[PDB]
Amino acid sequence: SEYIDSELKRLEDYALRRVKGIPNNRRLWVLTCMDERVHIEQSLGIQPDDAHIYRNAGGIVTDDAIRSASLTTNFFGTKEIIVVTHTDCGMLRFTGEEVAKYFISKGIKPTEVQLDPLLPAFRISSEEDFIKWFKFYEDLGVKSPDEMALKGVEILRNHPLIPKDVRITGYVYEVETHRLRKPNQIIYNETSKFEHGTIVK
């Protein structure tokens, strides 16, 4: 009875965290890609309830990412951000020119497409802006996921809507090993080639 009450209150508190001002278990927000192969929680070593996980095409900083990140940090008590791009990302496999050309071929008029139906204030007035909107790596002048992870970290770090006390870190998810690496730590070459090793003490 006392047990049931105790456990019911626990449920009430879980069901209404966002009413009560209860944060996620680890005060963590993650930006990553929507890709199926990015099994994000296992790679971070976290449990289902530990983090808020934002996912878009590319794990790239968009207005929506910044929107979501500003809310979680300022209102839902998140004190840590982790940006995780990944290998073989689709955003590194195509160009916005290709995509735009693909759409005009069907009959789409870039200038007069409602990009955010729920926010008509968002408009572009240029086909070059339409191309940049898709945020493909090449169009953004980004050569690797490593560079993109660093790019996103710097953006979020410098953005006014995100508190300065929030810790922000970037990684790259390797789909070929279901696991992270530090951006630009690439030991794949180093292991298949001579390097003078040291005698064990």
Q: Contact between 33 and Zn ion (CB under 5 A)?
A: yes
Q: Which of 10, 90, 101, 111 binds its own copies (CB under 8 A)?
A: 90
Residue number with CB closer to Zn ion (30 or 33): 33
Site for Zn ion contains 89 (CB under 5 A): yes
Size of residue set near its own copies by CB under 8 A: 124
Report residue 169 CA to chain centroid gap.
11
The alpha-helical segments, DSSP class H, found in the chain are 2-15, 17-20, 40-44, 63-74, 96-106, 127-133, 145-158
**What's the rounded Cα separation, in Å, for the pair 92 and 136?**
6
Interface with Zn ion, residue 31, by CB under 5 A? no
**Contact call for residue 129 and its own copies (CB under 8 A):** yes
All residues at 6 or more sequence positions from 22 whose CB lies less than 8 Å from its CB, including other chains: 13, 16
Q: Is 150 in the site for Zn ion (CB under 5 A)?
A: no
- Binding-site partner at residue 3 among Zn ion, its own copies, none, CB < 5 to 8 Å by type: its own copies
* Cβ neighbours around 122 below 10 Å, total: 12
Cβ at position 102, least distance to its own copies in Å: 7
Alpha-carbon distance of 172 to 88, in angstroms, equals 11
> Is 89 one of the binding residues for its own copies (CB under 8 A)?
yes
Asked if 142 interacts with Zn ion (CB under 5 A), we say no
